Amino acid sequence: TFGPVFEDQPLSVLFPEESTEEQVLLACRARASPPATYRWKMNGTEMKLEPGSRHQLVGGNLVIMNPTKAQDAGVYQCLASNPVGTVVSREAILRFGFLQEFSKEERDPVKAHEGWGVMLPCNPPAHYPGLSYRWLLNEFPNFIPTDGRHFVSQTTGNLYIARTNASDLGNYSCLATSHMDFSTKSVFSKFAQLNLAAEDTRLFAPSIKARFPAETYALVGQQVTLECFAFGNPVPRIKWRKVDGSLSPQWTTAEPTLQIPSVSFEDEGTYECEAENSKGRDTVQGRIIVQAQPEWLKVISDTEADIGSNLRWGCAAAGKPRPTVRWLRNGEPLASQNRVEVLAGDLRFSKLSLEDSGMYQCVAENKHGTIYASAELAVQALAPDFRLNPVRRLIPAARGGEILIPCQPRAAPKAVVLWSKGTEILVNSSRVTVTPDGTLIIRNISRSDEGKYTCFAENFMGKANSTGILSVRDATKITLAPSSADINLGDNLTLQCHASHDPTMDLTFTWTLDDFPIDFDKPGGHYRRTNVKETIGDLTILNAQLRHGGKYTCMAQTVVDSASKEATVLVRGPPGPPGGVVVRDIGDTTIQLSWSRGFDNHSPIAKYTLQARTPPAGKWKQVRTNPANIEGNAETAQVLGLTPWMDYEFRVIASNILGTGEPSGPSSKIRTREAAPSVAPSGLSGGGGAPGELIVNWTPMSREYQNGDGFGYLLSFRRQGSTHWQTARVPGADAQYFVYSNESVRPYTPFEVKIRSYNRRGDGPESLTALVYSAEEEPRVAPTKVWAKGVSSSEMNVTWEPVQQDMNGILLGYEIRYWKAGDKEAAADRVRTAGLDTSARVSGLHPNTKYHVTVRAYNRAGTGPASPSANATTMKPPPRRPPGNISWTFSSSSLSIKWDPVVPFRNESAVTGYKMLYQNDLHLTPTLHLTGKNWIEIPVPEDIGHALVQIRTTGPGGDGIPAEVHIVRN
């Protein structure tokens, strides 16, 4: 069974006077089981719906035959009643559409001045709803024309004419037109005669007589038309504006009837109409305040509740002005009662009972409407039933421990729990406690307390019992707790956790660190197990680091019971990271660094070491401070020893006795702000290069040697003994040379050079001061008295005089150019001497060839001109014939080889000696022997069977073509 919820509710109807329908159907039907009897209210009094009267109840719907205004106007309200409860439908305000005949008094004629406006009232009769107005210039259907001169009001119905003349006279009357659901009716008014006085020929101010009202209250969605009609001479314009904002541009008109099609909450504000002509102005202000019909936000639903519970029914509604939410119970109003609290808002039941069952209604209300929301409260009384939440049937307990056994059945209301051990009914005492929600508490469990525990349940509906079996075991306790420990990094540490338990059961050890479980199977695994038995749970931390410090909880558990002990391990006293490296006090080579502190678990910080780099070019090398060991309580120390014009990043390392710690993040890229150079140019050399010019050369210097901005070289050069110093000022790094030449500077001139650097703010220090000379030129003095003589077939000797010193500088050597007989100078071979010698030897020549020799002189700059020539002829070639009649005699340790001397031909040279290569069986390499005559002796030992003898000639002709003689000993 359920209470009545509506499917259709009664609507407000507009019944016309000229209706073709004799009945009014106010529809109401609510679904129900059993189907409801339906009562109707009229103005708070109940309608006696007798059969055969004019107010019949046809199917629930109220049918009213032939209504008139003094009998059936009012408010109507459907009440659906079953014996669950009574609900109230929303109110149907039955309004009568009627149009009365016009006012039959003899109205006065209207007198006004010509040239002004005129004011004729309509005086409309009593009506519903709001009429539409036009007037009549004559009989029907001759209306007033619609223009900018005649203005018809839809609020008061009067026609407003701005300026009148004598063509506007006519048969003036009012007219009304109403459009309704079943009929259309219009009715003519009384005759109005208008008379005009003499003409006031002036130009004057506008006078707005049609006033749009001061607080126009609109609902959301109502069409609102404001009116601002003006008198005056001449014709005024009408402007509409918004004072506190701007008009929305979907309906902006320059018309005296401003029409909004749908008024919403953004159109609320202060409005202004302005009339203005050529001679005056008039301003009229007003307001539109937008209100709302109530709509629901949070309503109530059909809740199933137990007897005795706390039920809070919140119910809220939104609308403008904000709705007084009130409550109905079963068609009657519900105030605050003995168990019922209404805060005009939530409905809070203190203790529920079975007389609170019924249809309750949330009603919201303001002056624009009244809305309703129904719910059923079904208060239920139940038997206790243990099929959803019973007592635990087969129960563990420990010896010396605690047991929480609840007995909470699905009972409405809260059942009387009387515990029993078998047949013995348990009473509260010093050991056994029956808490009156149902929970039995037994302290100090032994083996006399095991048994068959039955929880009884009782309310007025019925009874049930649920029976649990208590078994007493041994208690799991830790016999050897893990103690606190203090280690280092890299140490191994076990934590002892033995346990003792009942030997029927099983015992697992779970170790938790800071209430997170231990992952034994991590890659790079640290935690491992030692000494496996059943009841030994020793975790051994292997290669302990900083994340293994914290609280340890060895939980020995069975499936029924758990016991835990506490251990606290602290691993390293960490030389940790400092944070926020702040660079202060920026100087030339002096810079201030400040940092944060580290950590002090085992030990406080012993020292701070300081590091720097030039990023990204340079790396981390240790820089110097004063004091040279930074003391460990100092968060700031100042650092020296810097080389400027590089960017820098600074980090700091904390240290302890447990190892030098990992460093911090470096600081910001701080800029050096120098004012001085201090590094001299190195690698200074001078002299040489171009002839006649002073060229000084030196090394390039990179970024660590230059110091600062505006870098270049100051090379200072002057003549030895001169009183004038010349200074070169060239910027850049690539200019590693300077050339000075002048018309008064000759070759071999001594100069004094030194070099320093410069920057934007100073001059550099001095280099090595040395005396250099200007470079020499190529010579012009030829060699004299060149005489040549051949000494062999491939060598000749060329001699020349030691010549005088040239004007172009320093002579260093001589150059020999030579070519054959009949050849030229362009195919010559050029052989230079190693020094200033008066003679040299031309070697590598052909035999019997005449040569032409020219001697030139050279130095470092170039080669001078040629000498007068000399001629020489090489010696004859050696003879290609072998020596004849070769004989040999052996001995016990020697071999003597004799031969005839060589007689040459006419084109061959003489032989003054012989050379011989000798190879035997015991050696793989030949040996050289020399002689001056035609016989020789060589040692041959007794193991040699045969030998290889090659005989060639030597002398002034050169080495000849050798023979090859094979000598067998036996």
Ligand X SMILES: *[C@@H]1O[C@H](CO)[C@@H](O[C@@H]2O[C@H](CO)[C@@H](O)[C@H](O)[C@H]2NC(C)=O)[C@H](O)[C@H]1NC(C)=O
Ligand Y SMILES: *[C@@H]1O[C@H](CO)[C@@H](O)[C@H](O)[C@H]1NC(C)=O
The bridge status of strand 726-731 relative to strand 770-773 is unpaired
Q: SS3 of 334, please?
A: coil
The C-alpha atoms of residue 683 and residue 660 are separated, in whole angstroms, by: 42
Look at residues 12, 163, 36 and name the one whose alpha carbon lies nearest to residue 96.
12
> How far is it, in rounded angstroms, from Cα 599 to Cα 604?
7
- Provide the residue type at 125 as one letter: P
Binding-site member from 27, 49, 63, 73 for ligand X (CB under 6 A): 73
CB 405, min distance to ligand X, A: 14
> Which residue in 26, 78, 288, 434 binds ligand X (CB under 6 A)?
434
Give Cβ neighbours of residue 90 (< 8 Å, ≥ 6 apart): 9, 10, 77, 370, 371, 372
Select from a second copy, ligand X, ligand Y, none the partner in contact with residue 296, using the beta carbon and a kind-dependent cut-off of 5 to 8 Å. Answer: a second copy
Q: Which residues contact 368 (CB under 8 A, 6 or more apart)?
A: 219, 291, 292, 293, 294, 319
- Cis check for the bond before 321: say yes or no (omega within 30 of 0): yes
Contact partner, 492, from ligand X, a second copy, ligand Y, none, Cβ < 5-8 Å per class: ligand Y
Q: Is 71 helix (H, G, I), strand (E, B) or coil?
A: helix
- Closest distance to a second copy from the beta carbon of 345 (Å): 10
**Of 112 and 560, which CB lies nearer to a second copy in the complex structure?**
560
Q: Which does 490 bind (CB under 5 to 8 A by kind): ligand X, ligand Y, a second copy, none?
A: ligand Y
**SS in 3 state form for 173-189?**
EEEEEEECCCCEEEEEC
Q: Binding ligand X by CB under 6 A: which of 20, 52, 70, 732?
A: 70
Based on the shown chain and the rule CB under 6 A, indicate whether residue 34 belongs to the binding site for ligand Y.
no
Cα–Cα distance, 873 to 794 (Å, whole number)? 10
Options 154, 433, 678, 894; binder of ligand X; rule CB under 6 A: 433
Residues 478-507 vs ligand Y: string with x where CB under 6 A?
------------x-x---------------
- What are the tokens at 813? 């050597």
The listed partner (ligand Y, ligand X, a second copy, none) that binds 70, CB under 5 to 8 Å by sort, is: ligand X
Please identify, using beta-carbon distances, which residue of 132 and 492 lies nearer to ligand Y: 492
Of 241 and 414, the one with the shorter C-beta distance to ligand X is 414
The verdict on 542 binding ligand Y (CB under 6 A) reads: yes
CA 279, 283, 284, 290 torsion: positive or negative? positive
158: closest CA among 135, 181, 128? 135
Distance in angstroms (rounded) separating the CA atoms of residues 509 and 554: 7
- Contact segment (CB under 6 A) with ligand X among 402-410, 427-435, 529-537, 743-751 equals 427-435
Q: Which residues contact 742 (CB under 8 A, 6 or more apart)?
A: none
Contacts with a second copy by CB under 8 A lie at 265, 268, 290, 292, 295-299, 301-302, 316, 318-320, 322, 373, 387, 390, 393-394, 396, 471, 473-474, 502-506, 559-560, 633-636
Partner whose binding site includes residue 238, from a second copy, ligand Y, ligand X, none (CB under 5 to 8 Å by kind): none
Question: Token pair for residue 382?
Answer: 């139940």
- 45 part of the interface to ligand X, by CB under 6 A: no
74 vs 687, beta carbon nearer ligand X: 74
Distance (Å, rounded) from C-alpha 882 to C-alpha 884?
6
Q: Kindly state the number of chain residues that form the binding site for ligand Y, as judged by CB under 6 A.
A: 3
Shortest Cβ 73–ligand X spacing (Å): 5
* Residue 926 touching ligand X (CB under 6 A): no
Question: Residue 265 Cβ, how far from a second copy at the closest point, in Å?
Answer: 6
Q: Which residue is nearest to ligand Y (CB)?
A: 492
Smallest separation, CB 334 to ligand Y (Å): 47
Contact residue for ligand X among 12, 68, 262, 435 (CB under 6 A): 435
Q: Which amino acid is at 606?
A: A
Q: Does 722 bind ligand X (CB under 6 A)?
A: no
Of ligand X, ligand Y, a second copy, none, which one sits near residue 503, judging by CB under 5 to 8 A according to partner kind? a second copy
Exactly one of 67, 74, 345, 587 binds ligand X (CB under 6 A); that residue is 74
Q: How far is the CB of 559 from a second copy (least distance, A)?
A: 5
CB of 428 to ligand X, least distance (A): 3
Whichever of 350 and 492 has its CB closer to ligand Y, that residue is 492
Residue nearer to ligand Y on the CB measure, 491 or 647 = 491
Q: Minimum distance from CB of 532 to ligand Y (Å)? A: 16
Residue 797's DSSP bridge partners are 789, 841
Q: Which one, 200 or 506, has the nearer CB to a second copy?
A: 506
CA 858 to each of CA 412, 710, 772: distance values in angstroms, whole numbers, following the listed order: 132, 44, 22
636 interacts with, out of a second copy, ligand X, ligand Y, none, CB within 5 to 8 A per kind = a second copy
User: Which option in a second copy, ligand Y, ligand X, none does residue 74 bind, with CB closer than 5 to 8 A by kind?
Assistant: ligand X
Nearer to ligand Y, 570 or 646 (CB): 570
Beta carbons of 888 and 967 less than 8 angstroms apart: yes
Could you tell me the two tokens for 636? 């700031």
Annotate 894-917 with DSSP letters as a single string: EEEEE-PPP---TTS----EEEEE
Nearer to ligand Y, 398 or 495 (CB): 495
Query: Residue 327's closest CA among 338, 337, 342, 340?
Result: 342
Nearest alpha-carbon partner for 389 in 438, 341, 320: 438
For residue 527, give the nearest of 515, 545, 553, 550 by alpha carbon: 545
* Strand, helix or coil for residue 70: helix
Residue with tokens 């909450």: 265
- Note whether 813 and 835 are within 8 A (CB): yes
- C-beta of 264: minimal distance to a second copy in Å? 10
Measured from the CB atom, is 494 or 500 closer to a second copy? 500
Cβ proximity to ligand X, 375 vs 434, nearer residue? 434
Cβ burial of 884 (10 Å; 0-12, 13-18, 19+) is: exposed
In angstroms, what is the minimal distance from the CB of 632 to a second copy? Answer: 11
- Kindly report the backbone phi and psi dihedral angles of residue 546, in degrees, each rounded to the nearest multiple of 5, phi listed first: -75, -20
Which tokens sit at 100? 């009365």
Residues that bind ligand Y (CB under 6 A): 490, 492, 542
Residues that bind ligand X (CB under 6 A): 43, 70, 73-74, 428, 433-436
